[PDB]
Every structure is written in C-alpha cells, then in structure tokens.
C-alpha cells in the first residue's frame, strides 16, 4: 500500500531525497521496501556543431531521467502528515499512488 | 605495418575433424559472415570424397592443399621507370594462404550448380593432378621461371 515514485535528472539529489523519505516513513512505524532503482530513460539530441554547413562533426547530448521506487507496506496517519508535508524537493518530483 | 611484424590470428580448431585448417578454408568459403552455411558446405563436401572415393576427406583435403600451393612467384620491383616481374621464393604462410584462396577461387569457377559439389570435386582433382586451382598454381610457377633473368635483384 502507498507506492511512491520519484523521478529526477540528477541521480544524487534523487537517491538523496529517495532515502530521506524512506528513513522518514520508518520513523513512524510502517515497513518500507527499500528504494529500488528502476531503469533509466535516456533522451538524446544530436546536433550539427556548426551553425552553417558541416554535416560531419556534431555534438551528442542526453537528458537522463532517473527513476526510483519506494513502497511502505503498512501506513497509518503518522506515515502521512510526514510524507504529505515535510519536503525537500528542488530538482526532484514525486508521484504518490495509493 | 610500419611499427613491427603483423601477427597471425590463431584460428579455432574445427569442431569435427578439428585442425587449424578446415577453418581457414571454411573461412575462405564464407562470405557476408554467413558462416554455418559455409562450414556446412565444407562438411556437406564428403558425399564427393565419401563413397565417391572412400579415401577419407581430411586426408584428401590436406593433399590438395599441398599440390595447389606455390613455391615461387613474381611480384613487381619498383625500378627506375622499369618495373620488372622478378622471381622470389614464397613464404610458408603465403603458400597456405594462396593455396586455400585459389582452391575456393577455382572451386566457384566450375560448372556444377551446387556449391558443396563444386568444392570437393575441386579438392579431388586438386587432390592430385589437374584442377583449375592447380593450373593457377602452375602458372604463378611459370612466371617465376619465364623471368629467371630478372632475379639478379630481389628485395
């Protein structure tokens, strides 16, 4: 019960809050199946380096979107007021699915 | 190769008869990385050397390989605006390399419609005596002879 998925471009600030949420939920009862690392979606862009005309020669780019999963098996009112208020996301986004 | 001497790739022994050869050959039979279909063609080549002779493939094989490999050849020396054929012996490595090349080469020259039959039949003629490959080998032989006069300078 209460599955929480968190995505991020930075894998550090992600795993960061990823645990911060875990360490929290436990700190109120409720079991929590550790943050599992779901596969990454890589989005790349290949552009001509030059503005004019030099088709051979380009620069690759990628926007790696990281995903982490965290399940708290048996929640309760205590494991809500925390994970429904107490935050810390700046470059990370979480979706709560009950 | 400016730095130093090449280095020959060691081939994987044959799964059937084993032997470093057979693969070398099979590798020459093959095209487009389309092996299997090539290794097969070679084994398939028994029908014609098996019950067609009863001598044992591998043994005949190794006998053709020996009769179709050259012992001398002509190259081409960069003389001042001359460019001559010039004799020169042949390396053990080139002998085998050349021998297997012409074998398959001469093999796909024959009129039979089926590949498995072209080889083997060519291996057989070659096995001893004639064979398009042996003829090719007998010519590179002539050159080195027909130009024994330009042997005075060998590189």
């Amino acid at each position: 019960k209460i599955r929480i998925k968190l995505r991020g471009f930075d894998h550090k600030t992600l795993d960061a809050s990823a645990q911060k949420i875990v360490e929290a939920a436990r700190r109120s009862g409720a079991q929590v199946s550790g943050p599992i690392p779901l596969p990454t979606r890589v989005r790349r862009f290949t552009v001509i380096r030059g503005p004019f005309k030099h088709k051979d020669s380009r620069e690759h780019f990628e926007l790696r979107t990281h995903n982490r999963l965290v399940d708290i098996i048996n929640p309760n009112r205590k494991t809500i007021e925390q994970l429904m208020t107490l935050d810390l996301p700046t470059g990370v986004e979480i979706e709560i699915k009950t | 190769a400016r730095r130093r001497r090449a280095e020959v790739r060691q081939l994987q022994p044959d799964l059937v008869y084993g032997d470093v050869l057979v693969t070398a050959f099979i590798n020459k039979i093959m095209r487009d990385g389309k092996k299997n279909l090539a290794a097969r063609i070679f084994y398939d080549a028994c029908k014609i050397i098996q019950e067609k002779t009863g001598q044992e493939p591998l043994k005949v094989f190794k006998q053709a390989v020996e009769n179709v490999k050259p012992r001398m050849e002509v190259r081409s020396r960069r003389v001042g605006g001359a460019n001559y054929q010039v004799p020169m012996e042949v390396s053990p490595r080139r002998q085998q390399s050349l021998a297997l090349r012409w074998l398959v080469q001469a093999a796909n020259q024959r009129p039979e419609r089926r590949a498995a039959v072209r080889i083997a039949h060519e291996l057989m003629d070659a096995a001893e005596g004639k064979g398009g490959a042996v003829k090719k080998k007998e010519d590179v032989e002539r050159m080195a002879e027909a130009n024994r006069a330009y042997a005075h300078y060998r590189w």
């Binding site: 471009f9 790349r44 552009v47 690759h60 780019f61 926007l63 790696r64 | -």
Partner: protein, 60 residues
C-alpha cells in the same frame, strides 16, 4: 522577412495544417526540437551554458 514571420507564426490564422514549429530564441524555422522548443543552434548555445535543466555532453 523575419519579425513579420516570427509573429505570423505565433498567430492562429486559419487551419491547423498551415501552422509550424519555429525556434523560441531565434526565429529559426528548421531544426527545432519540440521537446525544447529550440532550434539546434540555440540548443547547443544553451546546453554549454548549463541553462538546459539536466542535459549534458553525451559520451558512451
């Protein structure tokens, strides 16, 4: 003919087939990635400045 066009595109003026993508930084018509709304000259110009969230030199 730039300004006249950059805006001529911002507007809806009939049908949906006549509409088209065009760089949000420069007026660029071709080579604009819809994920950024940027043309490939700008995409690089900004990527190097670290102004495109996430996004960095590839290498694999």
């Amino acid at each position: 003919a730039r300004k006249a066009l950059i805006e001529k595109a911002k507007r809806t003026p009939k049908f949906k087939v006549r509409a088209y993508t065009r760089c949000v930084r420069c007026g660029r018509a071709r080579s604009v990635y819809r994920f950024f709304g940027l043309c490939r000259i700008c995409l690089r110009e900004l990527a190097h400045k670290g102004q495109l969230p996430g996004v960095r030199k590839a290498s694999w």
